[PDB]
């Protein structure tokens, strides 16, 4: 969920890691257990 992006100092936008964080949530179902 992006909203008015602006090239911040030295950190890829919080929408970038949001994809990977969601990907990990899927991994849990595919692992039948949490990863923590």
From Swiss-Prot:
Domain of life: Eukaryota
Name of the protein in its database record: Pancreatic polypeptide
Residues annotated with Tyrosine amide modification: 36
Function: Hormone secreted by pancreatic cells that acts as a regulator of pancreatic and gastrointestinal functions probably by signaling through the G protein-coupled receptor NPY4R2.
Organism field: Bos taurus (Bovine)
Full protein: residues contained: 30 to 65 of 131
